[PDB]
Design a protein around this ligand. Structure first.
Ligand code: NMN
Ligand code: NMN
Ligand code: MG
Ligand code: MG
Ligand code: MG
Ligand code: MG
Lengths: 467, 467
């Protein structure tokens, strides 16, 4: 059983003794610190609110467990047993906190307030930043969703140029990252963030998370197809690669099937096995059931270009209405090795330069999609901007001399539309002047209850590309 | 609840139709592919065995749930209901799998077998690689534990050179990574891996994981100290930083206390506030209860060196028996911003060149320690090396033409010590010739039971530095 009293940074256990005496309010906010990378997708807070913060999260047993752990961990009694007991007794263990947030799926530039946190009881001034640690982990679904959407922008640009439309876009970047993330929980969170933008995934854990915490009208939010791995090819023995291919495509004769083709020599597999020995099993397939050839090694760009040149000389190629080469509809390629946002851009640009339509290719990405990301990418940060001490509110901030980029915002914050329709964050309570219309943040959590929520279908609509 | 039938890569759902007919055994192994590092710490498999693989993991409801999800996810009935129901009925839902592994905490060069997996019932040839995805996530605790031990080696070298001993080494690298990892589950796994090498942590989640899955004779495996954050300084107001510092060191007058000092001007704080205004509260403190000044911004090397120069001109400095400068015992520094293995090395080398002992400094590291790591760092990989088809064993492997570094090992594997005391992995069942002493792999899981377990104390002993 998760215990929120044990789900903070150790030093926060000692902070209730450090704030100014007679502090009744601590007010804090989360942002992606401003370096015009540009526009982030806000996603993932609703998971945290429901799984970890709502309802009766304090019990007498959890207080005693934490007391006993911290006594040994600090070799001292610093733990605030009385403060936690107050929440248990006064509010039946429900947190006296209010969180306001931008709607999930919203696409918003860096440097803006995304959510704010404050205590609703003066006795609980210390609780606001107790829960910093758990809320800051929202950096991860934000960053996965944002980086996935930035890859969708690249794919959309090159698909539109080379084909004239966006058909199939939502299946062009497939999540391969289940083995390459750091835990089962991370797999579900990260896969769900990718599914904000795309529909193809092998990280099954994302499906149940979406169903439980967000919801979709469709039975499931993402889809897959049968596909080989090296064990199912190499198990046949090195002299029997053709037999493995023949068996697999015949077992999956009326659905799309991906077949990894590089166990021994990708180029021989394409030109001689697929292109000659088994060609009669490929040209017979349906447009709804292509063979998808999967290289999985070598320089990603060089390998894709050579595979395409090989297949173009063994299969009938057409020229689409934009002038780009197109494999027949029963044959496609997926590159799933070494894919991240940089190599994805390299490959589609290299294909365009060689006059190959992006219709021909799809991508799989594991670590690059779900693991090779840190809180530094969008520079996600949670800071106190306002306190009330001795009944007087003061605007507070940090401004380190050697790094102006760690300067934080001052006072009570609100998010507004500008006259040109862009976003602005107002500081120092200036939203109250109503010169910029109403605050766009909404109360999503108050006093142990989730007060506003979004379906996964809503989030996908909010996160759409402009195109 | 967790459902192992939904905890695999989607394509593995389809692999039972792809292996050669008449296959009764699939045998697979895990390694860190050869060389770039040398030596890895094997850690974290026992967590996975106990949390996810042992006991009754198949039920009628879980089979039906997976059947329903996969029907929608694939738009097709491909799920192996018969094969999963076989495990349910014959084995009461216990997995007929045997896993053999090197003892946890063992320090092993790259390119060696670390564990193997095989099915114990011919009907379950498909189950070996079903569980690849969950087992390969062991890359994360292995990589955290290894990267943390490599930092410990750097610290030990420089501490020995500048002071003559290793006193305090185990508290020199403190885990700050709770907010910077991707999930609660990752936090506990990663923090527990760092504690293989060190004893200081703020990532509380690691403590409960170790207690539940490994065990220590001590009450807790890691420890912390009171410390400020920017909210507990800046809440006092920009003009009252000195009041915040004075309150905090007085509240924690008899334990070590870390006080972040860079809210507005780290160099003013050190020279004028600590070095003059509050100096009388510092020079009175015990050797067991120093003030630890914490910069948190700017260039990490330049900032540490300038802080040390400032403090050495305001406080009495000694020269130790190695010739290096030493602050008084009541005053220390912790650098917890921008710390990874590369900047840690930069800082201790820069200190040595300026004749400062590493006794003066400690480090905190969050993302660099627990999040900025991928499966590519040690190149962790799980592959099939042996199968039995029509009662004949065959040695199988991949060997892609464009990347010899993706070549996998052949046949039945074993791990041995060499005559010179190093390690060798024997292939093709050659361990059976018994020219090389006992196999170092031990059965840790068989038919749903954990058969061999290690305490956290044993793991720490196995992972000790040579020195
Ligand atoms: N359906 C699939 O083909 C599938 C699914 C999951 C992982 N994979 C593997 O994932 C690897 C890529 O992972 P990384 O992006 O983490 O390096 C590929 O080499 C690929 O073989 C493939
Ligand atoms: N006890 C502490 O001082 C403590 C604990 C946890 C995090 N932190 C913060 O962790 C940050 C470092 O995080 P990253 O290494 O992920 O960038 C520091 O800037 C530091 O303020 C400090
Ligand atoms: Mg692969
Ligand atoms: Mg790989
Ligand atoms: Mg900081
Ligand atoms: Mg930071």
């Amino acid at each position: 059983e998760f215990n929120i009293l044990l789900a903070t940074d150790s030093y926060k256990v000692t902070h209730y003794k450090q704030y100014p005496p007679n502090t009744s309010k601590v007010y804090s906010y989360f942002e992606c610190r401003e370096v015009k990378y540009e526009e982030t997708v806000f996603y993932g807070l609703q998971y945290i609110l429901n799984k970890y913060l709502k309802g009766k999260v304090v019990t007498k047993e959890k207080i005693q467990e934490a007391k006993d752990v911290y006594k040994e961990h600090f070799q001292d009694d610093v733990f605030n047993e009385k403060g936690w007991n107050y929440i248990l007794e006064k509010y039946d263990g429900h947190l006296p906190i209010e969180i306001k947030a931008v709607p999930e799926g919203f696409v918003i530039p860096r440097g803006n307030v995304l959510f704010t946190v404050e205590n609703t009881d003066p006795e609980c001034y210390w609780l606001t930043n107790w829960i910093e640690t758990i809320l800051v982990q929202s950096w991860y679904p934000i960053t996965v969703a944002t980086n996935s959407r930035e890859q969708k922008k690249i794919l959309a640009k090159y698909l539109l140029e080379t084909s004239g439309n966006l058909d199939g876009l939502e299946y062009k970047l497939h999540d391969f990252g289940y083995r390459g993330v750091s835990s089962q929980e991370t797999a579900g969170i990260g896969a769900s963030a990718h599914l904000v933008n795309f529909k193809g995934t092998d990280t099954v854990a994302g499906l149940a998370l979406i169903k439980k915490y967000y919801g979709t009208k469709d039975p499931v939010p993402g889809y897959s197809v049968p596909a080989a791995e090296h064990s199912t090819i190499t198990a046949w023995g090195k002299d029997h690669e053709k037999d493995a291919f023949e068996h697999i495509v015949t077992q999956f004769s009326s659905v799309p099937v991906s077949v990894v083709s590089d166990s021994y020599d990708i180029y021989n597999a394409c030109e001689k096995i697929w292109g000659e020995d088994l060609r009669h099993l490929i040209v017979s397939r349906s447009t709804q059931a292509p063979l998808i050839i999967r290289p999985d090694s070598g320089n990603p760009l060089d390998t894709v270009l050579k595979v395409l040149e090989i297949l173009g000389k063994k299969f009938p190629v057409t020229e689409n209405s934009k002038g780009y080469k197109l494999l027949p509809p029963y044959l496609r390629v997926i590159q799933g090795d070494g894919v991240d946002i940089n190599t994805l851009q390299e490959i589609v640009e290299g294909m365009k330069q060689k006059m190959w339509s992006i219709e021909n290719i799809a991508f799989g990405s594991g670590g690059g999609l779900l693991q090779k990301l840190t809180r530094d990418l969008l520079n996600c940060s949670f800071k106190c901007s306002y306190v009330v001490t001795n009944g007087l509110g003061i605007n507070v901030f940090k401004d380190p001399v050697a790094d102006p980029n760690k300067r934080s915002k001052k006072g009570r914050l609100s998010l507004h539309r500008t006259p040109a329709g862009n976003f602005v964050t107002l500081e120092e309570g200036k939203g109250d002047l109503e010169e910029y219309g109403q605050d766009l943040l909404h109360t999503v959590f108050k006093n142990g209850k989730v007060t506003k929520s979004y379906s996964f279908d809503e989030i996908r609509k909010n996160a759409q590309l402009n195109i």
